[PDB]
């Protein structure tokens, strides 16, 4: 029988025998908690066109916030961005008129809205406003529950970026570009 | 009107952890899978330092007749960096595997390979009949029995 005995000694000299080196796969375009060589941060890693110097690993901006990193395994540069962040506002006409409303998610593309809320809420109502046929991508964010119309009326409820929402028509909430008065010559 | 009611935040999907390349993986296989094994009286010593070890691949194979670690689980000891690790390799009779234990006394332990009462290392033993046995028998080993 072949026998091998492993004897470990910890002397005053620094430790040099290791082996816990967990290394997972690389994920891009997905909000994750990344740990790069002890640098821990939550964000969306994406392929970057930056050219770090051979000795440069991290990357920072004027605010001294890590905006880029270099994956040690392969000489690639990945930029970091916050996952989605944003506020949620409710565009609602006077309750005396109707109870239907619309939901505006600030500065986020409409694709991520269902996950940017987790969709695990009251089975109707909240899930109804997490998606639908009437989903409009505005410069102020994503609007769900309002029908975009090519017309232009006087601003009623200011959404932003020159876009306002109203209730006029089966009455329903619509979103449009505010008309800055009536043309005259 | 419009009222800012709440805030939303996309949570991390699962995780990601990335570390650099594997640098000179500790030569555990060089000793475990050594072509030549020294005798018990002259067990071969290999020093291990300045390397990154990986023994889970062989540990989970369940190919070892004994994988006994004293004072720590065989896998838990991995989550700790050591200053030096010595591998002592030899070949002994199966019935003699029990003799490689801390504080044990006998013809082999007291004369060939002695371990202290306080022991934290690991003892691994597996069958070697496929290499140390053949037609006509092998007589290439020696053992020390007499000493002052």
């Amino acid at each position, epitope marked *: 029988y072949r026998v091998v005995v492993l*004897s*470990f*000694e*910890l*002397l*005053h000299a620094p430790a040099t025998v290791c082996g816990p080196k967990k290394s997972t796969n690389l994920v891009k375009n997905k909000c994750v908690n990344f740990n790069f060589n002890g640098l821990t941060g939550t964000g969306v890693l994406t392929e970057s066109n930056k050219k770090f110097l051979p000795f440069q690993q991290f990357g920072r901006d004027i605010a001294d916030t890590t905006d880029a990193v270099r994956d040690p395994q392969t000489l690639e540069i990945l930029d970091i961005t916050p996952c989605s962040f944003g506020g949620v506002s409710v565009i609602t006409p006077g309750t005396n008129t109707s109870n239907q409303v619309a939901v505006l998610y600030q500065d986020v593309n409409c694709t991520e809205v269902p996950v940017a809320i987790h969709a695990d809420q009251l089975t109707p109502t909240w899930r109804v406003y997490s998606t639908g046929s009437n989903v409009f991508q505005t410069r102020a964010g994503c609007l769900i529950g309002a029908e975009h119309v090519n017309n232009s009326y006087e601003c009623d409820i200011p959404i932003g970026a020159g876009i306002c929402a109203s209730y006029q028509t089966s009455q329903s909430i619509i979103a449009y570009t505010m008309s800055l008065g009536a043309e005259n010559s | 009107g419009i009222y800012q009611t709440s805030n939303f935040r996309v949570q991390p999907t699962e995780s990601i952890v990335r570390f650099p390349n594997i640098t000179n993986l500790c030569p555990f296989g060089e000793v475990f899978n050594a072509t030549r094994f020294a005798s018990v009286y002259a067990w071969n010593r290999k020093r291990i330092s300045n390397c990154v070890a990986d023994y889970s691949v062989l540990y989970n194979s369940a190919s070892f007749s004994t994988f006994k670690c004293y*004072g*720590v689980s065989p896998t838990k000891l991995n989550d*700790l960096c050591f200053t030096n690790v010595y591998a002592d390799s030899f070949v002994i009779r199966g019935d003699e595997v029990r003799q490689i234990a801390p504080g044990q006394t006998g013809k082999i332990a007291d004369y060939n390979y002695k371990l202290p009462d*306080d022991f934290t290392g690991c003892v691994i033993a597996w069958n070697s009949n496929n290499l140390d046995s053949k037609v006509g028998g092998n007589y290439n080993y020696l053992y020390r029995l007499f000493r002052k």
Partner: nanobody
Amino acid sequence: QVQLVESGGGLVQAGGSLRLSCTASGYDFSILAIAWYRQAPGKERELVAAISRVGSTDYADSVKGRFTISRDNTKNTVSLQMDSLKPEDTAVYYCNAGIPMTTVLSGLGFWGQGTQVTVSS
């Protein structure tokens, strides 16, 4: 890496009592042995006490019967209590960490910073 921090000590009169604490970090406390050595000005370093990972204890003949050793694994702390202290005990005490291979007992283990203990006549 192995990190030890010593705390306590100070000045005490003859016949009093004192306590030294050693805090551990950067390793697994459950599989380690820890000891206290001491050194006085113009004197060689000598062992004061030692405790293995299984609660086994050992003292020096000069301090046996007066010093008590304990270790709290949950807090990863090692405590030494000195009773009936005498002026000869005045020294800097060092906390040493070693795998119980005689490594801690041989003084080849990791070292901290030390703590001063003074005993007046």
